[PDB]
Amino acid sequence: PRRTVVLAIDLQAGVTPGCFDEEGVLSRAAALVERARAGGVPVVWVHHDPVGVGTPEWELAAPLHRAEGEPLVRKNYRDSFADTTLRETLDELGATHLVITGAQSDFAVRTTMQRAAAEGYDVTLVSDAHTTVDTEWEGVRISGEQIVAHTNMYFSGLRYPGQEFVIATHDHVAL
Amino acid sequence: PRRTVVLAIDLQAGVTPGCFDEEGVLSRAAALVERARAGGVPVVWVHHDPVGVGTPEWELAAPLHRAEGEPLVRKNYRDSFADTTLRETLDELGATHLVITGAQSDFAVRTTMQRAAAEGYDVTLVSDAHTTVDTEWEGVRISGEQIVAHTNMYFSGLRYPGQEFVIATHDHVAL
Ligand SMILES: O=C1N[C@H]2C=C[C@@H]1C2
């Protein structure tokens, strides 16, 4: 029996500023979480401790708010499963299918969504609810917008035997 | 005791044409494999069967050649560990550290290098020995060159507790 969990990664006040389409992405993430709550779909929050434990930057970016009962997993690396309670938290919920929203597309989101796939989960990436910042390397620029687009392209074709991957918008993903 | 293995992914005649800097990348991959052979470092080849088993497109792109004794792992998905003999092949070699060259940067290479990291390997990505093609999604273009650059940027900062990740060129990586 499929149980869906929404996994909201590093949507922290110190992470999202300057990200591509920041206000819109935060707005659609919020809408997604509301829809999950209305559907009785569990929401699990992941926070990156190196943002600065105890500082305002570590807390959820506005307008996101955690509800009573919703687990919060703290991590120190890009992979939300690495040395964390995430797997235990998910197993306790009987999770089989993760619906992923968060930041940043190319770091925590990238590394966590691929780890989840490797672990055997069905994964749905919410195409209009993740973001990152402009960057450059080796003398070429790559915008946040380009990284978001390329991420959605990558995920749309991801396949593992016996597993299901879906790319879907915040208001069409099945909850 | 660290044992290094060079892992050469999908450098196939049907995969590399049209890739960014194709001739140069193939040349540096070849040089890397030669250096590994001279150093007694094992080389493991991975081929993507969906390229077309039994067709010329499935074979190694020129000027690459497999030597006697070098394992060849066949796969059907982006992740070279998914339903393959790769883990068994690596375990038989006592591999602890994988040096990765191949194509395409954003598909087989991306998915395999991250899976290797998740499995607990030390991984070195060879910065000037992987490539992919131009693409576009959501109305924005992202070049092969941009994807290669962004991949190297990503890998340069990848961290897992107790594991080591290095980004290094084909002629400086330690063999
Ligand atoms: O994706 C990310 N989440 C935080 C840690 C690495 C980046 C900032």
Ligand SMILES: O=C1N[C@H]2C=C[C@@H]1C2
């Ligand atoms: O990276 C890749 N290797 C082959 C399968 C998917 C792409 C072509």
